[PDB]
Amino acid sequence: GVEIETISPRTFPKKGQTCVVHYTGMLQNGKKFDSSRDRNKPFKFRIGKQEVIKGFEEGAAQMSLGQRAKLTCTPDVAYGATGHPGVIPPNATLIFDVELLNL
Numbered sequence: 001g002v003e004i005e006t007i008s009p010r011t012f013p014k015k016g017q018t019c020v021v022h023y024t025g026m027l028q029n030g031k032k033f034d035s036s037r038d039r040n041k042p043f044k045f046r047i048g049k050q051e052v053i054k055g056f057e058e059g060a061a062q063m064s065l066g067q068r069a070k071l072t073c074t075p076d077v078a079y080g081a082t083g084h085p086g087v088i089p090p091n092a093t094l095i096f097d098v099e100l101l102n103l
Contacts, residue, residue, distance in 0.1 A: 002055065003072050004062050007097075011065040016048035019060065019102035026095045033087050042101075053078040059098055068099035 013019050020042045025034040034044050045052045047061070055078040059071030078094045088094065 001057055001072075002077070004059060004069050007068045007070065009064075009067050013047060013063070013100075013102070016046065017098060018044050018046050020044050020103045021060065021063075021098055021100045021102065023056075024097060025061060026097065028093065052062050053094075054095065055092075056096055056098070059096065060100060063098055063100040065100060065102060068097060071096045071098045 003027030007039050010082075011020065013097075022036045023034075024037060027033060032038075035048075044049065047057055053073070056071065058077065059073065063069060063071075073096060075091065075093050079088045079090075082090055
């Protein structure tokens with residue numbers, strides 16, 4: 001049930017290539033469990049490395065250069081039964097506002 005809602009919008013990410021993006025997480029209650037903008041550090045990851053949750057990768061695969069979108073991820077594709085102890089509660093969704101700013 002993954003959905004992508006474009007926020008203020010064609011360069012699709014290549015397979016096995018790194019893409020930097022400043023993403024922000026949000027829960028239904030309203031608490032910020034992570035914030036890349038507050039850390040002031042650009043996050044980098046690889047698609048083929050499979051080091052990130054499947055929901056974030058699936059949302060970034062459909063994104064484009066210079067465009068942000070609320071990537072609503074399914075509970076199973078990201079922390080299905082358990083996640084980080086104390087950060088994400090079990091049986092809960094995870095909304096990531098990915099803002100792809102790759103080169």
